[PDB]
Design a protein around this ligand. Structure first.
Ligand SMILES: [Mg+2]
Ligand SMILES: [Mg+2]
Lengths: 321, 323
């Protein structure tokens, strides 16, 4: 339990002063279960935040236990002091910023008990102010999941409608992709380009809004047919566009190169749509492994923040207020 | 002469240099530049030393009292077969074949003898059979040249009109290409792809046929703005298609991938057309340095699809000539 989470940290960076994170958990353990801090500490370690953030395991202690921040800060430091306080100060809104999104992500995933007010409203709150905030942090895996869960609880029969509507044409649609995957992989293996060719992991809240704007009677067969390519270096990402276009005719005005032009900072992705093997618009999304690391899980959110409707914490409060 | 050896030698460190010294020496003793001048343009293609020797003593027998029986004994059977085989190929209205194309290409380059009937006829002959024969093997650099010289002589005022029309909009047209070359090169240097970005070399016989099939009123501004990207390895050729598409929007049809699907023998090359940089289509032609070598100086094609192989192909060739 403790070993795997620390192991998931160590592979990233051979770091010094391991005796703080042992101290962190030990003191927390002594201070239905105590796993939430460590469970969080793992999904933060999976993102790859600082060992101080990992320590800062001790975030829920001051509200639940008798001991206080003045005692806490002395044991570990001033940084842990500011963090645990900063994360505690954040409340429901009609380092510190990333720690919170993890805390909530887990709580959303684990809803064993469904007492009333917390349940429906947490979903509502997450969608309203946590999904976009997560999106500002540039981590797609955090947001995407947070939404789907939230969407299920808020609109159950609408979720049901989608997942049922998804399930109907699944066998025909899944086969169609399996051909494309083969057809695309063959030629790049002849071309000698090292690349992974996964299918796009799909999301129901996306499908919900995508349907809403299009209206009822929208096309189901091709909307759910998305594919991704992954490459080692920028050269190879541009090479993929080569092989794709060789196999199928591209569509005008739907082509992008975010590697060439970054929006909201470094997205580092190429998006193209082509007319398909059965005349289907198929959305391809080429990007590197290093760029994937950024796109889905890890970012610091330095610049190009924009309001709508640490310095980030006062920024965030302004955003909710 | 001395420099002929230098262009040949750096291709392949080879033994028995004495034969090519013997070749020129015995030829010199037997205007004597035509053999060696040919022997150079063959060496530029990169033919076998035996081919270099033969092409050095191929025309001797007709101009010189010495015969093939004496000639073959000095240099063996191979040079016997070559020098004879090429002589047998006469005027019509694989090593042997390549030597002949080099000869006609040289004689076409230098035409101080305008008086002979060949000036127009020899040109007529090359366009009818030698241009397709050169092209069939896979050699374009030879073909490209052969045509422009032949076509210039055959139709003087038509040629004049094409070069004139070309010259008119040249400054406006060359400026686009300078901007396109810059915009392309900036982004591939950011992408960190090693790639040369030359402009396409234009041909007037092509413009003649293109405008004939498309009629008099045709867009001269975008007809030939062609770019030619060049990269080391197959991977990088696909990477070029990337940078091009990043900058401009590609046409649905007119796309090809000859590396993936080589027409007849291997002509591996990526042809793509894109519009909207200037609101006009531009033809991009990506291929490897190796691929480029191959295309420009194709040694030969196994078969055109339209010794004994040489004679019968020659026979179809000669029928095309009669045509
Ligand atoms: Mg908590
Ligand atoms: Mg001769």
């Amino acid at each position: 339990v403790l070993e795997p989470l620390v192991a998931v940290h160590r592979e990233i960076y051979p770091k010094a002063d391991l005796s703080i994170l042992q101290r962190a958990y030990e003191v927390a353990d002594q201070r239905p279960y105590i796993t939430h801090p460590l469970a969080v500490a793992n999904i933060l370690a999976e993102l790859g935040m600082d060992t101080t953030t990992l320590v800062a395991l001790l975030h829920d202690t001051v509200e639940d236990t008798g001991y206080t921040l003045e005692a806490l800060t002395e044991e570990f430091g001033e940084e842990v002091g500011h963090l645990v306080d900063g994360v505690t100060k954040l409340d429901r809104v009609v380092r510190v910023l990333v720690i919170k999104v993890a805390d909530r992500l887990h709580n959303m995933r684990t809803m064993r008990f469904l007492p009333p007010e917390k349940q429906a409203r947490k979903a509502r709150e997450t969608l309203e102010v946590i999904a976009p905030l997560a999106h500002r942090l540039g981590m797609a895996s955090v947001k995407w999941e947070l939404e789907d869960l939230s969407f299920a609880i808020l609109h159950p029969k609408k979720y049901e409608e989608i997942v049922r509507l998804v399930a109907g044409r699944a066998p025909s649609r899944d086969t169609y992709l399996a051909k494309v995957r083969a057809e695309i992989v063959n030629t790049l293996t002849a071309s000698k380009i090292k690349a992974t060719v996964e299918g796009r992991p799909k999301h129901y809240w996306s499908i919900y809004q995508k349907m809403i704007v299009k209206g009822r009677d929208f096309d189901d067969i091709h909307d759910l047919v998305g594919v991704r390519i992954l490459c080692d270096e920028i050269r190879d990402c541009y090479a993929a566009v080569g092989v794709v276009h060789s196999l199928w005719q591209p569509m005008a005005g739907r082509f992008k190169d975010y590697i060439a032009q970054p929006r909201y900072g470094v997205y580092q992705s190429l998006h193209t749509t082509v007319v398909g093997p059965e005349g289907k618009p198929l959305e391809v999304q080429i990007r590197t492994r290093d760029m994937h690391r950024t796109a889905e899980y890890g970012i610091a959110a330095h610049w190009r923040y924009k309001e709508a409707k640490a310095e980030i914490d006062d920024m965030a409060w302004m955003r909710q207020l």
